[PDB]
Backbone:
């Protein structure tokens, strides 16, 4: 029913950019979540 | 009744604590500390996240009626957790909680005598406060959390542990650092947490094979504006928090 | 001290103590402004050891969940200025009191209606993953208008079917002795809805016998009375009953045949009635009829059809 989520191209978004700063880098903090 | 424990920004601004001259940001801070304390105690008492979550919601709701002036967050949190533990069928002995509360609030002093006066007094102060919480909440103890909806959804859209665990993580964070539990229904908050985890993690959920966006399988009111609007509000609330070592740490 | 969502019980006027209770426990009352008849149940706090009774929190959580025509209705929760009361919609009668009253007469058609409401009520609670765990005539209420209601959820808990790898370990010593199913007397902790329906069977028989059919004095005497009525407890009729630690450690009569129908025949007579009872009082909980099947059993769909109770309750 649902295709599998896919890694989007590096976001040029203003939201994705802001989030990367408000929470830190995902690939770095990922292993702690 | 349905819209009883949900408030507008006006109602949140005009809180009981505001009535006694507490900065909006200072009240937000008080809540964040109570949650942090609830989370700490919870992990020590060894209760599930669900138990903590509930206690946190009890707390958020408690302070839409009572003031931080009249009720310290450090007195209420233990009582709230004590109550939540019973409600969620993970009851912890009254002694156990008061001790653990001391371990968190006073890592210094010797665990007071269990036969002394100042202690027996704490046992009553907590039991009393539990009773006040119950009355303040109108004995409405059954809480619905975003986590339930987050899981059911990430299951549906075949998310990786990577993404699923991050969404779940964001859910817990929303209870800690924001008052979304007082503003938006759990299903909506779940969508915000997923949408956020996706942006952060760079995953994108396709449209289903029935031409319906993933959030439509969680809540029929959610739109992409709302997801952007609430994600914005979320990030905004985070920006205002003092040390964001609170996010990634506990 | 603001408290908008918990009203003072003063709003009701107390009229009487109901059921020769224990103390100032349950009162019949009326709203001072609307005249609404209610029943106030004071939350007992003799066991003040561990704060507000967790066992009471349980009851309230469940009462607030269960909203159905044949389940007692929790209106609200009131305080004093401390004590706490659970406020219910008043119910004039209770099945125990009715069957104790010699002047009360139940027609076959009316007994059908009673059992039908009772079973429809059980279907609802089990559907919402709840176990009553204290079935008995005393806990079956009926209103003046003839609507049956299940009551006393102070013993009830929620139940899950998960996780298919580890069984649930619930409180074993539950349900009044006289209404307790065999599986519980044998020491079962992984049980479910079937325990409530065994109770329903005991109650259905009471509708005719007018008294609890199996009044034991000890857990094992109860098991003995069950054997005398339902037949001996053997793996042949209850597969994998050997696994109960107590199956061997309990002196169990070995020769007993099944006498359920033969014994109640004198009281009941109607074949369909005897049959449904025979299916409710089944030793093997896995082979015991459930709520849904019971409600579609011929008993409820053969003459005389079930009828309302209003008329029969004025006497
Ligand atoms: N409407 C009522 N009238 C009289 N007694 C009631 C009523 N509802 C509940 N009770 C009694 O209150 C106790 C708790 O009932 P429950 O709320 O079902 O746990 C039991 O002893 C019931 O028989």
Residues:
């Amino acid at each position: 029913l649902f295709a599998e989520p896919y890694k989007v191209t590096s976001k040029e978004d203003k939201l994705s950019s802001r989030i990367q700063s408000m929470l830190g880098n995902y690939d770095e903090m990922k292993d702690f979540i | 009744n349905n819209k009883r424990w949900y408030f507008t920004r006006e109602q949140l601004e005009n809180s009981p604590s505001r009535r006694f001259g507490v900065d909006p940001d200072k009240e937000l801070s008080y809540r964040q500390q109570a949650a942090n304390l609830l989370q700490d105690m919870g992990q020590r008492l060894n209760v599930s996240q669900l138990t903590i979550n509930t206690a946190i919601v009890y707390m958020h709701r408690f302070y839409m009626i009572q003031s931080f002036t009249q009720f310290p967050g450090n007195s209420v949190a233990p009582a709230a957790l004590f109550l939540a533990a019973k409600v969620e069928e993970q009851p912890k002995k009254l002694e156990h909680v008061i001790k653990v509360a001391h371990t968190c609030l006073h890592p210094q002093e010797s665990l007071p005598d269990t036969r002394s006066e100042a202690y027996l007094q704490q046992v009553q102060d907590l039991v009393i406060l539990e009773s006040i919480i119950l009355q303040t909440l109108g004995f409405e103890l059954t809480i619905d959390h975003p986590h339930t909806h987050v899981v059911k959804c990430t299951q549906l859209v075949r998310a990786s542990k990577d993404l699923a665990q991050t969404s779940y993580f964001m859910a817990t964070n929303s209870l800690h650092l924001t008052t979304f539990s007082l503003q938006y229904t759990p299903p909506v908050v779940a969508c915000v947490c997923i949408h956020l985890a996706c942006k952060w993690s760079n995953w994108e959920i396709p449209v289903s094979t029935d031409g319906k966006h993933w959030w439509e399988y969680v809540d029929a009111t959610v739109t992409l504006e709302l997801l952007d609007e609430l994600t914005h509000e979320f990030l905004q609330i985070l920006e205002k928090t003092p040390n964001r070592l609170k996010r990634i740490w506990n | 001290v603001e408290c908008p969502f918990c009203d003072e019980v003063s709003k009701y006027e107390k009229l009487a103590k109901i059921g020769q209770g224990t103390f100032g426990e349950v009162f019949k009352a009326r709203h001072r402004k609307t005249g609404q008849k209610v029943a106030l149940k004071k939350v007992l706090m003799e066991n003040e050891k561990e704060g507000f009774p967790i066992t009471a929190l349980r009851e309230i959580k469940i009462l607030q969940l269960l909203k159905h025509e044949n389940v007692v209705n929790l209106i609200e929760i009131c305080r004093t200025k401390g004590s706490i009361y659970l406020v219910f919609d008043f119910c004039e009668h209770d099945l125990a009191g009715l069957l104790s009253n010699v002047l009360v007469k139940f027609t076959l058609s009316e007994i059908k209606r009673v059992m039908q409401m009772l079973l429809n009520g059980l279907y609802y609670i089990h559907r919402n993953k709840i176990l009553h765990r204290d079935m008995k005539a005393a806990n079956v209420l009926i209103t003046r208008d003839g609507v049956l209601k299940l009551a006393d959820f102070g013993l009830a808990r929620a139940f899950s079917l998960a996780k298919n790898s580890q069984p649930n370990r619930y409180t074993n010593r539950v349900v009044t002795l006289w209404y307790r199913p065999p599986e519980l007397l044998l020491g079962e902790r992984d049980y479910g809805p079937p325990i409530d329906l065994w109770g329903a069977g005991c109650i259905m028989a009471e509708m005719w016998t007018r008294s609890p059919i199996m009044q034991g004095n000890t857990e094992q005497h109860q098991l003995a009375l069950i054997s005398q009525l339902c037949g001996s407890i053997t793996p042949e009729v209850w597969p994998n009953v050997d696994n109960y630690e107590l199956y061997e450690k309990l002196e169990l009569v070995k020769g007993q045949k099944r006498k359920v129908k033969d014994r109640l025949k004198a009281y009941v007579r109607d074949p369909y009635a005897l049959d449904l009872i025979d299916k409710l009082l089944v030793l093997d909980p896995a082979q015991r009829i459930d709520s849904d099947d019971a409600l579609n059993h011929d008993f409820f769909w053969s003459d005389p059809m079930p009828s309302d109770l209003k008329g029969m309750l004025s006497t």
Notes: Strands of chain B lie at 203-204. The first strand of chain B starts at residue 203 and ends at 204. The first helix of chain B runs from residue 9 to 13.
